[PDB]
């Protein structure tokens, strides 16, 4: 046995799963060698067959011999377009391009459902320093030229929303001089709907609030961006303002969108789908959290947030527990979150929404566009299970989920029919996320950048609650954004403390049985 390294990519996960089945060996990791694990020619051919059947990827036998470890063979698949239906390559020029599944839903909701400013992505930044307004504008103009998503409009062609990519588009920086307090009210009123027929779907206001003090207001439509894209846009704006040259983009959003449409007709897509249909084939559980107030008959989006630090000692213990069990910190926390919900809800079958970046290939990482996907993660925190074995179930289901991530959540919801309810969300009523901090000031040559308004969107709650773990450098912090119509601050602060008690207990003794975990 090689040292265990847990799968780090979608292809490492997919391959490892296949090797485990074919070889009948558990816990195959990135450094494991097929032939060291006991495979020979017969079972190598079975691995090739299995990857063809499950993923429509044709791996020559010669390559398995040449690249006998999970990490090498995964790298080969990532770098190979031939006989790989998952490969995203530059597409032939066309008058219009299909929208992605996520774009299609946003378009339809925006146009037929009347979704106001719900798909806006506003941000504000306090800039203290010299700052040249014309250079601000010029950097955005370059960004718009660079990123096709910022030159994309939408039209309906043959009954489908489609992407209309524009050569060049008009853009001007909106400049104003206001009081700081006036800026605070403006920043809210400046959030306004976008006409989806008109590129660019980004707008910028620069507000001079003093001498060397500015607020930069930026907004864009979620159909052409996401959280990761906003980070890219910010970083590249700062670089472009300094006059830096940015690296060329091999692949664009329309390439991904065309691929997704082609992929939808493949045997591989049917297998991606089949996993999810099987997973939710039986009785789909509805989370029964105790609420302080009666659940409204229509969904309420009013939200609030609370945050608490886990402490250095516990954060370190959780890291070591992940290390010790062959899991990620993400998995340990998700596992702990499932037991938290199980105890509050008095249930042993629970679905938690887990957002993923959707950027499962190197080429997708630098693209500005809508990639974020959600996986409905189902687990069964039964009282008799040890946390250790439950955590392994969470790991296994996570890896399986990541291996079948190329099925749009939009398709799953429609394909499963409905057990819907307007007072709650499809498949899951809570979301779990885990992040690694991010800088309060990244700075410019003559300026300093920082937040202006209280940041993020914690006042709006799409789900009953969203549980967020953030590794802040000196500790992991636990954030809960919750529906004001359902929970008091007191209840949610206690909910958070109970998570930390569960976390402490499982670090103390990972083999404790779920029912024996004294949460209080
Ligand atoms: Na697996």
UniProtKB/Swiss-Prot annotation:
Sequence positions bearing O-(pantetheine 4'-phosphoryl)serine: 41
Location of the Carrier domain: 6-81
Assembly, per entry: Large multienzyme complex of TycA, TycB and TycC.
Family: Belongs to the ATP-dependent AMP-binding enzyme family.
Domain notes from UniProt: Consists of six modules, and harbors a putative thioesterase domain at its C-terminal end. Each module incorporates one amino acid into the peptide product and can be further subdivided into domains responsible for substrate adenylation, thiolation, condensation (not for the initiation module), and epimerization (optional), and N methylation (optional).
Remarks, miscellaneous: Tyrocidine is a mixture of four cyclic decapeptides, tyrocidine A (D-Phe-Pro-Phe-D-Phe-Asn-Gln-Tyr-Val-Orn-Leu), B, C, and D, in which Phe, at positions 3, 4, and Tyr residues are gradually replaced by Trp, depending on the relative concentrations of these amino acids in the growth medium.
Function: Incorporates six amino acids (for tyrocidine A, Asn, Gln, Tyr, Val, Orn, and Leu) in their L-configuration into the peptide product.
Descriptive protein name: Tyrocidine synthase 3
Classification lineage: Bacteria, Bacillati, Bacillota, Bacilli, Bacillales
């Amino acid at each position: 046995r090689s040292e265990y390294v847990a799968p780090r990519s979608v292809w490492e996960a997919r391959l490892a799963q296949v090797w485990e089945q074919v070889l009948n060996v558990p816990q195959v990791g990135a450094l494991d060698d097929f032939f060291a694990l006991g495979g020979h020619s017969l079972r190598a051919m079975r691995v090739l067959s299995s990857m063809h059947n499950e993923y429509q990827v044709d791996i020559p036998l010669r390559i398995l011999f040449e690249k006998p470890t999970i990490q090498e063979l995964a790298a080969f698949i990532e770098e190979t377009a031939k006989g790989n239906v998952f490969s995203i390559e530059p597409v032939q020029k066309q008058a219009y391009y299909p929208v992605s599944s996520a774009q299609k839903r946003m378009y339809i909701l925006d146009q037929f459902e009347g979704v106001g400013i719900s798909y806006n992505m506003p941000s504000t930044m306090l800039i203290e320093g010299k700052l040249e307004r014309t250079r601000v504008e010029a950097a955005f103009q370059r960004l718009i030229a660079r990123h096709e998503s910022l030159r994309t409009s939408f039209a309906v062609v043959n009954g489908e929303p489609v992407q209309n990519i524009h050569e060049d588009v008009p853009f001007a920086l909106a400049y104003s001089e206001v009081t700081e307090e006036e800026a605070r009210e403006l920043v809210s009123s400046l959030v306004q709907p976008f006409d989806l027929e008109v590129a660019p779907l980004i707008r910028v206001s620069l507000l001079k609030i003093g001498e060397d003090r500015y607020v930069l207001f930026t907004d864009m439509h979620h159909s052409i961006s996401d959280g990761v894209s906003s980070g890219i846009l910010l970083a590249e704006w700062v670089q472009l303002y300094q006059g830096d040259v940015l690296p060329e983009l091999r692949i664009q959003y329309k390439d991904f969108a065309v691929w997704q449409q082609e992929f939808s007709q493949s045997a591989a897509f049917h297998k991606q789908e089949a996993y999810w249909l099987q997973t939710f084939a039986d009785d789909i559980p509805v989370l029964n959290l105790p609420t302080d107030f009666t659940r409204p008959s229509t969904q309420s989006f009013a939200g609030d947030q609370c945050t608490i630090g886990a402490g250095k000692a516990l954060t370190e213990g959780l890291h070591q527990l992940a290390q010790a069990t062959g899991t990620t910190l993400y998995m340990v926390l998700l596992a702990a979150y499932n037991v938290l919900l199980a105890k509050y809800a008095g249930q042993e079958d629970i679905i938690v929404g887990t957002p993923i970046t959707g950027r499962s290939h190197a080429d997708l990482e630098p693209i500005v566009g809508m990639f974020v996907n959600t996986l409905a993660m189902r687990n069964k925190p039964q009282r008799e299970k040890t946390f250790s074995e439950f955590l392994q179930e969470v790991k296994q289901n996570a890896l399986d989920a990541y291996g079948h991530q190329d099925y749009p959540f939009e398709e799953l919801v429609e394909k499963l029919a409905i057990a819907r309810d307007l007072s709650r969300n499809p498949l899951f009523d809570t979301v779990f996320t885990f992040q690694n901090s991010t800088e309060e000031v990244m700075t410019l040559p003559e300026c300093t950048l920082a937040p202006f308004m209280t940041d993020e969107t914690g006042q709006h709650a799409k789900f009953d609650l969203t549980f967020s773990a953030t590794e802040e450098r000196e500790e992991m912090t636990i954030g809960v954004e919750y529906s004001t119509s359902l929970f008091t601050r007191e209840t949610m602060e206690r909910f958070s403390r109970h998570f930390l008690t569960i976390a402490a207990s499982i670090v103390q003794n990972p083999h404790i049985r779920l029912g024996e975990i004294d949460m209080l």
